[PDB]
RNA sequence: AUGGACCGCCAGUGAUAAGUGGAAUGCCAUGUGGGCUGUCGAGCCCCACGCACGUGGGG
């Protein structure tokens, strides 16, 4: 069982621990987000039991860490006072203060290839191919790369993360081999953060911590693609086989 | 349906005024393009004539 999910695209955000106007992303995908991505693909209404998703495992290798950028993002500004965001008391604030100013962060030009291994993950892959709601990378405005699922069915996909999945253009030294790539596994634990989603109900979303261990591993330098456009070519060669 | 869903950074604005690149200056001195030379028998068809050697008409 298992399939390869490729998270790529111009921008993707995987925030955790932010609860005000400023938003912040983890430099790598968060299990909560990917689980919600599958739940959205399967029609799981907000508030439905998320234990079906329990028992999955997410090893994620970071091809390009990507640049982290902060996207300004106002809400309601430049509108007449009557048509701005409501207050909790119900009376709209004065128009010179009715604007909301959020500073949301997002990863741009970053690409990870998570190898999801679970009990029903093959039905989940078959659900991403025909989604109930549009899958997106973190914020809904970010739209996933068309090669969202590199392979629908793979026996031992981590074995395919160690090798035989192409890689972006990187420095390849003379007489070099085995270019270093950071794999992320789920003592030797990088960080602890609230990921595993106890409930997605918008009224009270709650989570619990998951330790992450990031192990730099060594994959053959043959894997990295040539400088220009070759990455797309090798990747497409990869999807048909 | 993902610390997410819904979500504008935005309303305004001459870069202006002034200005010779200017004065002087031979690319000069030398060189065969030469020897040779009369312009004097397939061709595909139709038709007419023929002394079946050959003539002519048309395409």
Summarize the structure.
With 241 residues, this protein is an alpha+beta fold. It is 15% helix and 31% strand. It has four helices and eleven strands.
Give the amount of beta strand, in percent: 25-35%
Taking the alpha carbons of the first and last residues, their distance comes to: 18 Å
Radius of gyration from CA coordinates: 20 Å
- Secondary-structure content class: alpha+beta
Helix content: 10-25%
Largest sheet: 7 strands, antiparallel
Main sheet: which strands, in order across?
8-1-7-4-9-11-10
User: In oligomeric terms, what are we looking at?
Assistant: part of a larger assembly
List the domain count as a whole number. Answer: 1
Overall shape: it is: globular
By DSSP, the count of extended strands is: 11
Number of H/I helices: 4
Order of helices and strands: EEEHEEEEHEHEEEH
PDB class: immune system
Keywords: Cascacde, surveillance, immune system
Entry title: CRISPR RNA-guided surveillance complex
Name: CRISPR-associated protein, Cas5e family
